[PDB]
Amino acid sequence: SVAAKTLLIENEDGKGSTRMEVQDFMKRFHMHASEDDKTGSPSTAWGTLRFPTKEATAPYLRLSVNDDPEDALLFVKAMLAQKYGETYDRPSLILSVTGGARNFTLPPRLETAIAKGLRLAAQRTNAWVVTGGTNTGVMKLTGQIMEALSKTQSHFIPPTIGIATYGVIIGGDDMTRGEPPKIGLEYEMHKKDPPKTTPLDDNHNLFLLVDDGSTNKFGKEIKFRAAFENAAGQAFAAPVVTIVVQGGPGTLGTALQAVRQGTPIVVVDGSGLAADVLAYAYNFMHNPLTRFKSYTIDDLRQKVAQTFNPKSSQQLTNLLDSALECVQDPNLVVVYSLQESGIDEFDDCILKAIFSSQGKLGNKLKQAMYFDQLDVAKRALSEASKNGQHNEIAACINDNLMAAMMHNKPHFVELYLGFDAKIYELKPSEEV
Amino acid sequence: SVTGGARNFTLPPRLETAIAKGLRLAAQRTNAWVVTGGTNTGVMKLTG
Amino acid sequence: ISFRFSLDQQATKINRLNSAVAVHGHTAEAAEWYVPPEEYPKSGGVKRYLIDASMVPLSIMCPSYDPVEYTHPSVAAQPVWADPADPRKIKFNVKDEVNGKVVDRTSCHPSGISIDSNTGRPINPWGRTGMTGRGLLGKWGVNQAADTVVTRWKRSPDGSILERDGKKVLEFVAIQRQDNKMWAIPGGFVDNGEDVALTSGREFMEEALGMGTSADLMSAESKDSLAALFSSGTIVARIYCEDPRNTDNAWVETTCVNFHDESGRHAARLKLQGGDDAEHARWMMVHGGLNLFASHRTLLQHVTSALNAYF
Amino acid sequence: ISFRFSLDQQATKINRLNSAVA
Amino acid sequence: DLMSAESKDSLAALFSSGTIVARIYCEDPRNTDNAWVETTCVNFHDES
């Protein structure tokens, strides 16, 4: 339709948005014409892509490796602010989906459980889902899960942000050429692009194409993706939860990076490969059940050797050492398994990962309210009460009661009112 | 005879409900004389 | 089922032949012998004289042996814990008094320490390292180190001890070293005029607990709990250390002291916080695939051998 | 559980150093 | 066919702990008065 000329970019104070011209704001993103180039030129590749059989268009931004992730975060906030107004539903959860690049088939019960839990978590927390954005494997699977969410729900649809390396994407030249922005640009996934062979997933709602001037090289967007998730987590005061489904050797290093920075991970057991390796390793080191007493480092080494097939013994030793290093802290890894947890317990695993993360008690009570787990909130309040954190309970009880009233949770309203919270002492969030 | 803390204290709601229900049932069934300290703080105020 | 397994493992718990030569062929790996890395730590790129692992022992001749003599500037500046530069007045293999303070100077090697006639420097009985001089080590000959392995059984919330391979699983306090960022057992060199008893406890409070200059003062009951924990220790091993700072004239030998908490009450009261020459400290699971600094895996093997734990 | 505890305590039931002076 | 590099290590681990249980005369039908078979028995037990 009519191309946008002005955008509401949020101020650094976090209290207001200023209206400014689109060409003025978008100048800060750079692109590289070739690998040799370092400084670059301003990006002419941004706009919206129209995918066949999809009603809505997805914004795309091609940005350099040296660009600030806060600027990209401002761009995503500006798109959401433009489409849904200034008072759009802020995310209380960032869901990072990592795993296998190549295509894989999962069992129907397991797929149904992952799909149901991810949809419930995304619709209850208005979560930002960050994946790789290509039309293969876990990214395509996550897109398929969120496709039903975009159909069954009206007004706000939780974003499926795809952060991909620009050098492998089919149709990059078509996206680059022209005068920006490109309103409703047709994306031809079946068009024969000669050097590149990886297309974008049509179910992702927003695209960040990270460019370094290289062609047909993967893994260039990992650091920016991690930085963007951390930046989003600091900005919205929301936990970042990584989800690991299948995965190769680099997924192990990605999970290792996630657990070293304090970010919790949810490992899907039974999906095969690196997820099975991570799940075995945790179960070997931490799980007290009987069927995990026969687990050994030798059988784990055999499992790593049969799945990842290393060339050398030293490579196998390093992979085994890294896998054991990821599950050192039992709080930061949550393993979801069908034969132990249950079909309708994946969202509970996501909530346990949220509670195991670093955050304030009031925010954790709000997350427990969103998932409708009254027992978890009762246990958290009792544990906080026993450990001498009564001051934080009294400090957050008013805001928790307010949040419980807004999100239609009457049992939580009764629970918060029972712990000496006066009804006539409520306070508004903003200042009149 | 109700004895305990002189200073004010907050109990969990389930525990408070259980103590209140049991003490009321015992007092109404036996026509019991409840002897406390009589001041408006703590366990005496709670018994009141 | 847990009890069915437990009862099953409760009953299974000159005439020795090794037939592995039939599968592989001719064997002779000789991987037991320790060879330190080429670049000396914290020396600014100073490199040793390389030696294959089949040339390390002193019984073998090796005529092409030309080690490099290097001493660190910190050791050469002469602090209180550093021996004098001329070792001719130092008496080895007996307890020697320097400035009225007792130093051990006895090695756990059965042959003993042999003294070179030309320079008076001691010769390492555990093999060649391709390097003479003291390096980063302050004392000629045996640098006595004490390591503190504070252990507890790895337990789940319900209170049951975790069991792997039919044996109970241990858990030890591990520190991340400041110099090389590898996890290790807390411990340090034995100071002049003091014994292993004071040294083991003092280094564990300074490094694992941060009780030197990096933490608040403990309560009167926590000190009694820590004293109760520290009153029952067993010396499990006294071995040579595969430490990369070792040279031909100065080598580290360790005495390992294990403080085991059977009930787990005293171990649970410890507030782990890295101090001194340690960045982070944590309760870590003991197993055979651990990648730790120097020969601490051998020390953990000795602890699990003594306690009949999983390794 | 009583038996789980009982079986757990049924398996735990010159080289001596006193480091309480530190 | 040739075994994998980890199966050979597993078989070597199995074969590294053997106990000679008996060294006896063999009731072999090919035995004669001037040539008889005597056996050494090696047991490789897999506890796990």
Ligand SMILES: Nc1ncnc2c1ncn2[C@@H]1O[C@H](COP(=O)(O)O)[C@@H](O)[C@H]1O
């Ligand atoms: N014989 C010794 N050799 C080396 N360092 C020693 C010795 N006795 C005490 N020390 C001290 O112990 C500290 C621990 O070593 P480091 O981990 O390198 O800091 C050294 O920095 C020295 O200050």
Ligand SMILES: O=P(O)(O)OC[C@H]1O[C@@H](O)[C@H](O)[C@@H]1O
């Ligand atoms: O004195 P620092 O460097 O702190 O530690 C000495 C270590 O050097 C190793 O051989 C010993 O096991 C001992 O733990």
Ligand SMILES: [Mg+2]
């Ligand atoms: Mg030291």
Ligand SMILES: [Mg+2]
């Ligand atoms: Mg130390």
